[PDB]
Amino acid sequence: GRLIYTAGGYFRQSLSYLEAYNPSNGSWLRLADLQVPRSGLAGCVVGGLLYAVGGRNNSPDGNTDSSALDCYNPMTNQWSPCASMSVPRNRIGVGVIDGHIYAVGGSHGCIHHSSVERYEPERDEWHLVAPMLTRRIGVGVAVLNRLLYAVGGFDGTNRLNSAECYYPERNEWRMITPMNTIRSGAGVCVLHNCIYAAGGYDGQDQLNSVERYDVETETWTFVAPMRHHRSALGITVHQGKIYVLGGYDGHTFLDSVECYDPDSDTWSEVTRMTSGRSGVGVAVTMEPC
């Protein structure tokens, strides 16, 4: 599309911000808030509609994991509730295949989900599919050549370098090569033929290391690291470049927005969000109005 939308996030409490960045001119636009604050959600786009999936409302009033699915229409600048998932999913991962949305992992209280479910926008319905071989919260999810990939996370006791791949026509999950680094809460996306895992938390430190998985060779290789360590970051791809938004570096909730150009293997700073925050949902679609 044209704009990078960032929904929700966390700074001292869960947030309801929806803001859109325009890489063409550097400008941010504040849009309609989410009806319910939430961090740890995921964002995605189908048919020019933006979707906020899962998450958790951390608030003074209390803490409520979200099973919600809310759609935003850029034309109207309005949110509508969609059907809820079978179960709340905080620190969720999502991916889109064939106009269908896959919700992966996440926590509900102290439950750490291995379950997965699929939303069909034309019927406004969710259905459970095969569970991952591993429980994963704070899991990175990406789609490549119509296969779904779950990368890293936290299974309840250990944080994971493991990764697995879902094969829809077989309704089956299989392990792939693990990463070289343990990561939970990394930004995971797809560029060209590789799956990128950036940043995250390895149990001790927030990471700035970035690595990528080549589906042909089935290996992970590090690329240039980000200028900032960060976990619970937002990530997306726009015109051949990776954008990472916010996160937590162990000291500050970052407003930094970094851009990776794969041809030069460099990260440059590109803008600041209007305020520091972690755990945002991020997606890309056309301009509002």
Ligand X SMILES: CCN(CC)C(=O)c1cccc2c1-c1ccccc1C2=O
x/- map, 126-165, ligand X, by CB under 6 A: ------------x---------------------------
| Nearest residue to 7 (alpha-carbon basis) of 108, 36, 248, 231 | 36
Report the residue number, 10 or 119, with the smaller CB distance to ligand X.
10
Q: According to the binding rule CB under 6 A, does residue 67 interact with ligand X?
A: no
Contacting ligand X within 7-36 (CB under 6 A): 10
CB of 135 to ligand X, least distance (A): 15
Reduced to 3 states, what is the DSSP secondary structure of residue 18?
strand
- Beta-ladder partners of 147: 144
Smaller CB distance to ligand X: residue 10 or 166?
A: 10
How far, in Å, are 51, 56, 89, 166 from residue 72 at the CA level?
6, 18, 20, 28
| Radius of gyration of the CA atoms of the chain, in A | 17
Query: For ligand X, what does the binding mask look like between residues 199 and 238, x meaning CB under 6 A?
Result: --x----x------------------------xx------
Residue (231 or 285) nearer to ligand X, CB: 231
Position of minimal CB gap to ligand X = 185
Give yes or no for a contact between 211 and 180, defined as CB atoms under 8 angstroms apart: yes
Q: Which helix (H) or strand (E) holds 114?
A: none
Cα–Cα distance, 217 to 134 (Å, whole number): 23
Nearer to ligand X (CB atom), residue 212 or residue 229: 229
Q: Interface residues with ligand X (CB under 6 A)? A: 10, 138, 184-185, 201, 206, 231-232, 248, 278
